[PDB]
Every structure is written in structure tokens, then in C-alpha cells.
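agent: user wants the structure for Beta-lactamase VIM-1 from Pseudomonas aeruginosa. delegating to structure tool.
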Amino acid sequence: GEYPTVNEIPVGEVRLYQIADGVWSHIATQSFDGAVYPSNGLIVRDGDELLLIDTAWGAKNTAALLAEIEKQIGLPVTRAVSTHFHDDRVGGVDVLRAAGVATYASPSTRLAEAEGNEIPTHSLEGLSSSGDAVRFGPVELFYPGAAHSTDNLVVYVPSANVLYGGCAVHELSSTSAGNVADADLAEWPTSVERIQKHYPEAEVVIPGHGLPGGLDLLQHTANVVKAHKNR
Ligand SMILES: NS(=O)(=O)n1ccc(-c2ccc(F)cc2)c1C(=O)O
Ligand SMILES: [Zn+2]
Ligand SMILES: [Zn+2]
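agent: tool returned. relaying C-alpha cells verbatim.
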């Protein structure tokens, strides 16, 4: 019943968590640079189809994700959006494409190709300036500006007031800015402020890693990033 945690998910299975009517998170774990981390994505019901937000961090995990979706939901995943270029977002795109899923990301998310990561097939125009938003099936995609990465997108589910922050939003227990290798710590608080202004009615906020909460995850993120930079 509780939100599943890193030591509760062996690397290779995937759990789903019901967030709201027609909205689930997916939780997987993966090893990176010798430590194991949980990671979140989103599933949003799209009539009799599903929209997937982010892979489950790797080919095997993403295959397991599709299997878990078939077991627990039983509707086909037809489209996926990756919210930035790192492997916890695009690793598994090749598995999705071979399972009939049309894969999408912004043109900026060029970064996957340059890094040697898997590359979504279709480009999402209309998201190149901070504050841009586009509709994509049952969600709104929002580019808040550089934060965790320069390309990071946010996803809002208006039917349920669910804000999926991806890696630009940290969980409340976070004490650090996470993997900052590709981050912009100077702009990150400004980007979070843009999210706060755009989605004041969000009821659930889902971080890229860790436990969902409410709107406080946004301010908390700004605080831990400012403190990391300052420190
Ligand atoms: N998206 S990513 O760069 O590949 N990634 C992988 C692991 C982590 C991570 C998260 C929390 C933490 F406390 C430590 C690490 C991240 C992240 O910061 O988004
Ligand atoms: Zn990342
Ligand atoms: Zn991440």
C-alpha cells in the first residue's frame, strides 16, 4: 500500500502506484556508478490506450514495465514521452519502439544522441523557450527552463491536478541536489518558480526519484538547490 522504496524493489522488477483516477506512477531501480537508486515515471490513461512518461531506466526494466502494465492495467501503451536525455528517462526507448510505442522527446533532448543514449523517434516542437507548454493527449508538457538538465520537461495531468516534475523536482527527504553533472544550479530555482506560478492548483507532485507529495516539493527543491550551490 505504501509508496515503494529503493530497498523494496530489486533491480529488474517494476511496481506501479495508483496516483489518481487514470494516473499511475511507475517505480524501478537501477545501479549507476556503483549505487542503487529508485526512479519514477508516469502512466496516464488516454481513452482505451495509455501514455507513458519516461522509461523505467534500462532495457530490461522497461520490458518489465510493459509486463507490469499488462498485468495491472491491461491497456496498450501507444505513446511515450521522455522528459530529459538521461538513461532513467530514455534508457529503454529501443524496447518501447519495438513494442509498438511511438516515442517522443523535445529536439533538445540532440543531447541523448551526443551522449550515446537511446533516442526517441519523434521531436516535440513548441517547447524550446522557458514557459512553453503544449498539449499531448491527456497531459500538458511544460518546459520550465534549465534545472536538473537544460532540457528537462514537466508534465501536468489536468484531469487530476497531478504535477510530474521529473528530475527537476526532488522529494521532501532529499538533502542534496542529486546528480548535478548536467545541471544549472543558478537557473534551477528560477525554473522551479516558473513551475510554481504555472501550476498553482497541483494536488500531487511527483519527483523524478522518491516519494510523491504536495506543492511543498517545489519549494523544498528550490531550497536544497540553493543550499547546494551556496555551500
Ligand atoms: N536522472 S539522473 O541524473 O540520471 N539520476 C540518477 C540518480 C539520481 C539521484 C537522485 C537522487 C539522489 F539523491 C541521488 C541521485 C539522478 C537525479 O538526480 O535525477
Ligand atoms: Zn537526469
Ligand atoms: Zn533522475
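agent: one observation worth passing along. The helical segments are 59-72, 87-90, 93-98, 111-115, 188-198, 216-229.
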